[PDB]
Design a binder for these strands. Structure first.
Lengths: 58, 57
RNA sequence: ACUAUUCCAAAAGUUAAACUUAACAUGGACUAGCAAUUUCGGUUGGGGUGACC
């Protein structure tokens, strides 16, 4: 629910005026974790905020 | 978030205790270096256990 | 939308019992130079000008 989200943009956020479609893409950063089951260090470029949920999923 | 320290570092609390630190300091230091763990009631029982047997012996 | 900024966030440090830093990439509003859509009355001894509604 992040990658490739294309919405619409307005000026005063109340529109009697023009509406122009705007593109939105998620932020990408590197997250290094360690899997003991697979015995492998993993690198995830995935969603930042999701990692905050993963930390609560442990 | 709430984390369980495997060791005593600086001023937080006693070793094994569950304390809430900053997100950056917590995630970028404690977790990857094995200095601490997340908060799971399962191993929080281990917290209460080790702590109980600490002041005991 | 593109080329350059002001702030708060992401990422790093600092003290005491609340504050300072940006190398790469990516955001929210925001300030300039660039660009994007249309409008362009009527009456009228033709129209425009003038006058009038």
């Amino acid at each position: 629910g992040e990658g490739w989200v294309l919405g619409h943009r307005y000026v005063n956020n109340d529109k009697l005026s023009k509406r122009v479609r705007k593109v939105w893409k998620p932020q990408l950063f590197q997250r290094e974790l360690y899997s003991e089951i697979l015995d492998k260090r993993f690198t995830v470029t995935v969603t930042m905020r999701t990692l905050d949920l993963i930390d609560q999923a442990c | 978030l709430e984390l369980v320290l495997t060791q005593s570092v600086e001023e937080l609390g006693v070793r094994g205790d569950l304390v809430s630190v900053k997100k950056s300091v917590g995630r970028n230091r404690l977790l990857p270096q094995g200095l601490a763990v997340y908060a799971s009631p399962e191993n929080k029982k281990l917290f209460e256990e080790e702590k109980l047997l600490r002041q005991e012996g």
